[PDB]
Amino acid sequence: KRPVRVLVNMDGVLADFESGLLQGFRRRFPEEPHVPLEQRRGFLANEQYGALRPDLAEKVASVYESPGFFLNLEPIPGALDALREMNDMKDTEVFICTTPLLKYDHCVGEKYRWVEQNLGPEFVERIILTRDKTVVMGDLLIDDKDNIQGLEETPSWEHILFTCCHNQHLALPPTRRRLLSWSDNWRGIIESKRAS
């Protein structure tokens, strides 16, 4: 009966944060050690750089804290096509669910403009900003972060782990489902939820 509501995360799922961060880092700090994408481990890139050398955490953070960083991210391959297709499905509801930096200044407005520019005004209406995704109601949350925590102990959604460089090597119990890319069968996953 109900439409299936799909919460789609922004960084790592629609917007290519990892590519944008590396390219920005190499351009700004061309003499510093970097972490190639294939070597990324763990959600927070600043913490990986920090573990390489403590001051690199602040340097890498200065890249994503800069004006224009979020504005100019390239889309994840296939994301715009998939989201448009998903959005057009009957009895299917799409929201974009994104966590802004606590340093919100050059992040929150740029995320709105990114959606307007890469997807369209129609998608801006479906943006949800939150630091706690567990209080947002949906059937699915497609998100590259491995451990999603918040105040709601049993969220209404099932978390589908979207594959990204930083979570590629992560071993998950078989109860946890992954989306390998937008070319993996996200449609079937949506149908699995309609069925229950």
Question: Mask 16-55, x = binds ligand UMP (CB under 6 A)?
Answer: ----------------------------xxx---------
Q: How far, in Å, CA of 51 to CA of 157, rounded?
A: 33
Q: How far is the CB of 50 from ligand UMP (least distance, A)?
A: 10
The answer for residues whose C-beta is within 8 angstroms of residue 163's C-beta and 6 or more apart is 144, 178, 179, 180, 181
| Closest to ligand UMP by CB, 101 or 170 | 101
Q: Which residues bind its own copies (CB under 8 A)?
A: 3, 5, 93, 95, 100, 102, 104-105, 108-109, 112-113, 116, 121, 124-132, 135-138, 151-152, 156
Rounded to the nearest angstrom, the gap between the alpha carbon of residue 70 and the centroid of all alpha carbons in its chain is 12
Q: How far is the CB of 127 from its own copies (least distance, A)?
A: 7
Q: How far, in Å, CA of 44 to CA of 65, rounded?
A: 14
Structure tokens at 153: 């102990």
Helix axes 79-87, 186-194, angle to 10 degrees: 30
Q: How far is the CB of 31 from its own copies (least distance, A)?
A: 34
Question: Would you count residue 12 as binding ligand UMP (CB under 6 A)?
Answer: yes
Neighbouring CB atoms inside 10 A of 170's CB total 16
Among Mg ion, its own copies, ligand UMP, none, what binds residue 109 when CB lies within 5 to 8 Å by partner kind? its own copies
Among ligand UMP, Mg ion, its own copies, none, what binds residue 92 when CB lies within 5 to 8 Å by partner kind? none
Q: Which residues bind Mg ion (CB under 5 A)?
A: 9, 11-12, 144
Q: How far, in Å, CA of 54 to CA of 102, rounded?
A: 21
Strands (E), 47-123: 92-98
- Binding residues vs ligand UMP (CB under 6 A): 9-12, 44-46, 98-101, 107, 145
